[PDB]
């Protein structure tokens, strides 16, 4: 015989589109490319593991041509994949 | 200057190579706990005989399981691009 109460009440989700986004998704500034750039490469093979995971999962490269090296060209990378990989690493760290 | 001495620790498990003609097929067995220690020989458990320390080898603890293929950032001809190189385990 031991009695202790929990407590969880209320739940609501409210969200829609960010913008119209009639295109694929290119509302990214150069600053956005710069932000995901340093944030990825400063962090070890864990986040470098996540960046190479996503780019090679959509478009493979290294496995065909020199698997010991990969270059992630953010400035000429698709802004869809950039903004996707950006929000992914941001929610992967949850740090401010 | 080489003193005819092998430091074998008493209490250590050591592989005792079968004393006879120099063939790779007579190998060591055990490993046996060192009971007695002299400058040039040692007596161990299991074999119940004195062995010359040149014909003996100290056993390994185990090792260190440490592996991970990882990416390393080099400075390239870049605005904000990076070059990730897969390093050894």
Swiss-Prot record, chain A:
Ubiquitous. Residues 18-96 form the NET domain. The modification Phosphoserine is found at residue 19. It is found in: Nucleus; Chromosome. It comes from the Eukaryota. Interacts (via bromo domain 1) with GATA1 acetylated at 'Lys-312' and 'Lys-315'. Interacts (via bromo domain 1) with GATA2 acetylated on lysine residues. Interacts (via NET domain) with CHD4 (via KIKL motif). Interacts (via NET domain) with SMARCA4 (via KIKL motif). Interacts (via NET domain) with NSD3 (via KIKL motif). (Microbial infection) Interacts with the Integrase protein of Moloney murine leukemia virus (MLV). Belongs to the BET family. It is linked to A chromosomal aberration involving BRD3 is found in a rare, aggressive, and lethal carcinoma arising in midline organs of young people. Translocation t(15;9)(q14;q34) with NUTM1 which produces a BRD3-NUTM1 fusion protein. The Bromo domains specifically recognize and bind acetylated histones. The NET domain recognizes and binds the 'KIKL' motif found in chromatin proteins. Chromatin reader that recognizes and binds acetylated histones, thereby controlling gene expression and remodeling chromatin structures. Recruits transcription factors and coactivators to target gene sites, and activates RNA polymerase II machinery for transcriptional elongation. In vitro, binds acetylated lysine residues on the N-terminus of histone H2A, H2B, H3 and H4. This is Bromodomain-containing protein 3. The gene is BRD3. The chain holds residues 554 to 640 of 726 of the full protein.
């Amino acid at each position: 015989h031991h009695h202790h109460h929990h407590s969880h009440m209320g739940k609501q989700a409210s969200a829609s589109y960010d913008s119209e986004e009639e295109e694929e998704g290119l509302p990214m500034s150069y600053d956005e490319k710069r932000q995901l750039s340093l944030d990825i490469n400063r962090l070890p093979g864990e986040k470098l593991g996540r960046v190479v995971h996503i780019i090679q999962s959509r478009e493979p490269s290294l496995r065909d041509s020199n698997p010991d090296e990969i270059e992630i060209d953010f400035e000429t990378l698709k802004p869809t994949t950039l903004r996707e990989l950006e929000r992914y690493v941001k929610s992967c760290l949850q740090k401010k | 200057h080489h003193h005819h001495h092998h430091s074998h620790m008493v209490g250590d498990t050591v592989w005792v190579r079968r004393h006879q003609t120099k063939n790779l097929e007579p190998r060591w067995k055990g490993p046996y706990t060192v009971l007695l220690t002299t400058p040039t020989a040692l007596k161990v458990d299991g074999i119940a005989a004195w062995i010359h320390a040149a014909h003996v080898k100290a056993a390994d603890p185990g090792g260190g399981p440490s592996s991970r293929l990882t990416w390393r950032v080099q400075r390239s001809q870049n605005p904000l691009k990076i070059r990730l190189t897969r390093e050894a385990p």
